[PDB]
Symmetry: D3
Subunit: 251 residues, 6 copies
């Protein structure tokens, strides 16, 4: 029993029902090596797939690529193969002055600035995490000693105009997104990323458990470049946190 | 000093920063009498306002009326007078067969089938509660001995067509809402009500903490009529739960 | 055959096919006492219901609460009990400099800034009164000696941001409503209220006759504060006008 | 002199007119104008034929619009530039209610905005409604002609074919948006279809101009029977008598 | 047989499967006289219809009137009578400084600022010409010696606010269209007209081949007033170009 | 110098390239680059593998995009920052018309915008259409290869599954918006589904960049026949031959 993109069978997952889903294929092996008995399964396109064992239970680690479309394929195919719980770990840009580089954010809902979420539920439907996953992520993040923020994330199909960046080839932002960063800031939105609206909407409308946790790598209100050591520490802590959140989800 | 509709002053609230907001004016005194030193403040239109004390802290109880528009006035005016945390307690119709009459539901996100939410944030923005409020409501519900569900609520500007009821004067439902109850059922939505989309969107986009907990009074999938005793116990338990959730928020 | 919310039966209405529907429950007895043989029927939540006799014919008076959602329940349940004609009487904020406190407005169409209207007809459908009701209301208003304006009303699900009020807790108005009062003023819109779009859409799309008349209590463009006397005269004239408009509708 | 882009007339040509009658068909302009005093041809360009005439001593314009909101919006704007403030549309319509007969008249109280041009003047939320004095005058003139008159909502479509849910077409298909739409409008009490009122009424109600629409019923989508030639000819004559009498009510 | 508006039969078209569709009824005879054996068929409302012969093959010439609605009727009815290819020739306002009066524009796609296109395909569908038509129009326009621009056209249901003209009776443009001309300019749109979105969408979605070619009669960005000779030469070249494009389409 | 956020290359690395070939799959980048002169690996990060090569003496970039508009939009933007002005997409597609066979090629003339990223560049009304020179070059190159070539509209979806109306899925459900959609596109003459052209074409047409899309048909949603290995291998080889010849036509 096979899937179109991921290159793995149900047997290859050794009964896993929980997946950790980073964006970058190069992070998959790093996450898997935090657990026991990491095994490389497949790599094709942006999809690198490992298995490992956590407290004796099989866990998948599968990259998604950037954006909702590639994410939606990985989630669907993993679900076909028995996965029911999806933990997303990644990086994010904060838009609130109070949020520091190196803090962690657990998304409580996403602003749906994507398209793929609409392929699962109409816009009125909330891009919300599973409560148990969000609770596990907050606990794992806080137990690590990180400063943790719970709140709304703006989830964009673009890095550039949808995050209201003007330092671009055209220097233009379409009307819809002009003044948008200030609006989200005034509404209390914490951060930008590019996958949570699709992931959370698709899972919450499909009987799958999902959540998102991210390390803050930049703050759009601070012009200074963050410290290399702080970025290193943040990346390392983010993947230790998601594995501890996975531990808390196991039954 | 004063507000347009609620007929109270900041001084009347004796420093309260938390409000319990039922819909029915007649339930305000019932909630207030579970706390210490309940005092009637005002009644105008659908807005009945009491003050009380919980663990030595002032707490407001204010009715909202039915629907997002009247709710939005109460929340705004209370926020002008210093309230920052809003706990909604109410009744709901379940639409999932596994949810029984007498169970409780804590909303993790709302389907925005309202209008007033759009006066605070565009449709993309998620109608989600404050995570600490949702956590406190879950804990208080569980500690009451209730069966508790966390999940998505469909929040409608109408009782009739927007809940896909056909036993009406015209017997017609507009195209938008034809087949909608089955759509939400298949997407895992737990229940219908008429205020959470407005409340959660307004508060999440305005720096206010909000959540919603409800007792299930009917299940749209079950022919059995619930008896008077189970209904009476459900309304009593709901208001005990919301006051214990308030205690957890003030702690 | 006792309706869900209003607490009355078809028999209670003694054959009435016309209702006067103010917003405030406290105004119901005042309007009923302008007619013969006023009788209190029920009070639950924002719904106070009286019956009276006008030229020997039974007339209902029923409050709606603030907003389309609570209005839509009252209209539906009255229609279930045989009511076919709905006369709304209310207060309003004028937005045109030529409209004075104490004038009366008869709505010829509403700007649909609500949500509940969409639960009856798609946005393309006009929120239009019944021509006979509008004609009766104009005649009653003019015969009273009032200065009467016929025109478009902006009908908002909120009192605050949807009427472009900035004197609020956050002082923020969402993009959709920023600059909206000037836009409506430049398009000749007379006034703001919160129910007519729902009422007129639901009735025009359901085989029910409806209209709206209002006394002006404030003008958003005038700095002067109206005196207590003028406002009292205005409230009194508004309810005398709606009863005379009811007399003109009786067959 | 004051000129306009499309209509080919000047403000002076209108001799002080503040009221226009606006049929769709250029060939109907002279027919309306000859019911008044001193009709004079002013100009014809594209679908816009323009006459002046006099009604109870006051100047009146008669100007065709062509089919559809876009061409109508040009005529209204340019007439407004030249001092016209009141616009009375007369036309033909298909009824969709079984109780409305061929030969009846409909005065529109509001339009379903199934157009595009209305959105160039006001967002969809804004009501496509007539000026109350114009509708009142139209109703009175229609009743006084002996016609059976209906007041109600009109569905105003940018197409004759799919937007009126016609299937007897080249493709036989109707886009999803319009599938089931005639039954929907029928159940909502809509009286009739036409192609200009949403644009006209929205444009005018949002621009300080007084507008209304009155129409003779030429077909009923629910009746298999073919109307006879006589009934149709009588209907077209009575419609233009009615709109001129409505104009008379508006001028005094 | 016959059709509702155009006043012609299939036999009247003597086998024609290609139509040239100008807007102005007065231009029909001019275009037909560029071909052999022009014959007047009918005139009703804005629809003047002629048939002619091009390289021995029958060609229809039929005016559309201004706007998508009247265009949509002509196209439908011609299609009922066997026409499959539609060549629009017209005038246009350039909005780019590099486009001169006398140049020719062949539309490669239209901005759908119309309503009638939506009656054939949802907004996501592209208002795109048939590739063979566009190729033929490019070749004919270049062979004439004109300077030819291939690109996007903004297709508006109005001449005034939808082209962001302020020199109007009210001097107002609705919010949707404020700043729109600069937006289209920055997006590289070449010109405005009023029919292409409807024509291209209806044909591309209905199995019919369509394209648009236009002579530039004015440039919104240039101060120079085109002289009488250049405008007369441009109108003349435009119709010679469309007939040569028709020649290229004949099989 | 300056190095962009994601692609890990500098302007100098591109040796003056103003044209990029942008496949989806990183593994296809070297395969395209080796059909040209002096291919050199530049960088690999995430789904972005970047080579340079020379075609008729001129520098050409080859850069993978990943699946979907979002990751595509990043690659196009960053290449444009580094001087690229022309973008040629080559990929695979599922045909939805019975007349289109596995092994045919499709050149998109316009895309149905069933994506989200296109809206971050232009509102929905704006057409997702290719540069006419690119589409012309792609047609010519495809015909010259011996392929059967179709010009027409492509449905461009943010999903592989529900947005292409697939029911053989974990839930077996398709959201209301997409129920019936494949028949709807079929009856409107749409040729095929893919996942990037709406974003690419809208982004470039609204930003002063020239773009086009050509694809080899790997499946037909209306056919039960399973395509054989040899036909699929020949299709993939021909597609990349075609895009390089189209590039040669663009540089000429
Ligand atoms: O503002 C940001 C900052 C980091 N990310 C982000 N947006 O989106 C995620 C993309 O996968 C990718 C875009 O670089 O990494 C994540
Ligand atoms: O399906 C239901 C069941 C109970 N409620 C509801 N919907 O909405 C709440 C309204 O305020 C009011 C409507 O009766 O009570 C709550
Ligand atoms: O601007 C105004 C002025 C008066 N009203 C109004 N808006 O809406 C009506 C609400 O029911 C309620 C809001 O106070 O009273 C009416
Ligand atoms: O169903 C109908 C019946 C008559 N009309 C109509 N729709 O719209 C008007 C068009 O201008 C034109 C279309 O034939 O005439 C009017
Ligand atoms: O800006 C312009 C310039 C010329 N046209 C135009 N817009 O639209 C076409 C209309 O049919 C009509 C509007 O005058 O002529 C064409
Ligand atoms: O129906 C199809 C068939 C092939 N593709 C597709 N849709 O979209 C392209 C995706 O990048 C990826 C999805 O497999 O490959 C292309
Ligand atoms: Cl939170
Ligand atoms: Cl084509
Ligand atoms: Mg102040
Ligand atoms: Na209420
Ligand atoms: Na026309
Ligand atoms: Na990707």
């Amino acid at each position: 029993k096979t899937v179109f993109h991921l290159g793995v069978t149900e047997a290859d997952l050794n009964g896993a029902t929980l997946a950790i889903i980073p964006g970058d294929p190069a992070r998959v092996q790093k996450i898997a090596e935090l657990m026991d008995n990491p095994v490389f399964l497949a790599s094709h396109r942006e999809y690198t797939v490992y298995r490992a064992e956590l407290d004796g239970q099989s866990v998948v680690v599968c990259s998604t690529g950037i954006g909702g479309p590639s994410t939606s394929i990985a989630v669907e195919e993993l679900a076909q193969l028995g996965v029911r719980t999806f933990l997303r770990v990644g990086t994010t840009g904060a838009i609130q002055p109070h949020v520091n580089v190196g803090d962690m954010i657990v998304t409580t809902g996403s602003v749906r600035l994507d398209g793929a979420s609409l392929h699962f539920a109409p816009m009125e439907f909330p891009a919300v995490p599973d409560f148990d996953v969000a609770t596990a992520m907050k606990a794992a993040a806080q137990e690590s000693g990180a400063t943790v923020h719970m709140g709304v994330t703006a989830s964009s199909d673009t890095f550039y105009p949808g995050q209201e960046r003007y330092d671009t080839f055209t220097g233009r932002v379409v009307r819809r997104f002009q003044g948008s960063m200030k609006e989200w800031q005034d509404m209390g939105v914490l951060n930008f990323e590019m996958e949570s609206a699709t992931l959370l909407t698709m899972c919450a409308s499909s009987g799958l458990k999902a959540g998102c946790v991210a390390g803050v790598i930049i703050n759009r209100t601070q012009k200074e470049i963050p410290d290399h050591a702080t970025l290193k520490e943040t990346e390392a802590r983010s993947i230790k946190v998601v594995v501890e959140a996975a531990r808390k989800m196991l039954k």
